[PDB]
């Protein structure tokens, strides 16, 4: 059994691309992320998603953006895709000015808080650190 | 009658819990790089979890960090697929 993906629109693909962070936070410029953002934009356009690229969003704009998006009318949309490109920690993604709990972002799309996506696949793609451990790997 | 409010989410993380994620200044991050390519190659045939699995394989086998800082040299990465999906996801119909 598989999701019905023959609604009139595949759905939205929201890409948040954070490259430059306020000094207060003291994080490095995420060099290479523009290549990521454009690659995603073309890839999802090819899958027939309505791509909206957003750049250098504060933690406030990310939360407002997600709410406004969750308040749209996804009835004729098959799905929802959100791509987060930024610094992060376990459970956290960063706005240009600071951290935000990922849960705060995904809760807007809960099955009861966004009815026109109820029952449809909601994809979050997250490029960002989840802490500071390194994987030394093992030879095979 | 009712479905869980947490159902039908998929979280495609670039790296395992507690770990760093790697980004190349020139080519882009390892995960996104690999994700776009697998989608490009397979989204017309494979179910989405299968595609993310091949993404897992690509990141695990084809990347390894290079650094003049031995702390960060020769390091590896595995992405982390978290699925609450209840059905198969094909990007075509």
């Amino acid at each position: 059994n598989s999701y019905k993906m023959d609604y009139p629109e595949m759905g939205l693909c929201i890409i948040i691309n954070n490259k430059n962070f306020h000094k207060s936070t003291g994080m490095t410029s995420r060099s290479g992320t523009d290549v990521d953002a454009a690659n995603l934009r073309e890839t999802f356009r090819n899958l027939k998603y309505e791509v909206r690229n957003k750049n250098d969003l504060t933690r406030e704009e990310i939360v407002e953006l997600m709410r406004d998006v969750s308040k749209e009318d996804h009835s004729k949309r098959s799905s929802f895709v959100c791509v987060l490109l930024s610094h992060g920690e376990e459970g956290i993604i960063f706005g240009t000015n600071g951290p935000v709990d990922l849960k705060k972002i995904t809760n807007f799309f809960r099955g009861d808080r966004c009815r026109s996506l109820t029952g449809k696949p909601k994809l979050f793609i997250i490029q960002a650190c989840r802490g500071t451990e390194l994987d030394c790997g093992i030879e095979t | 009658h009712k479905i869980p409010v947490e159902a039908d989410f998929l979280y495609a993380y670039s790296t395992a819990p507690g770990y760093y994620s790697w980004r190349n200044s020139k080519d882009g991050s390892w995960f996104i790089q690999s994700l776009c390519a697998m989608l490009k190659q397979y989204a017309d045939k494979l179910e989405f979890m299968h595609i993310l699995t091949r993404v897992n394989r690509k990141v695990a086998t084809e990347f390894e960090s290079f650094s003049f800082d031995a702390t960060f040299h020769a390091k590896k990465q595995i992405p982390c697929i978290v699925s609450m999906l209840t059905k198969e996801l094909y990007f075509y119909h």
């Binding site: 995420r30 610094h87 | 980004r23």
Partner: peptide, 4 residues
């Protein structure tokens, strides 16, 4: 290569 850098870290996110």
């Amino acid at each position: 290569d850098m870290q996110x």
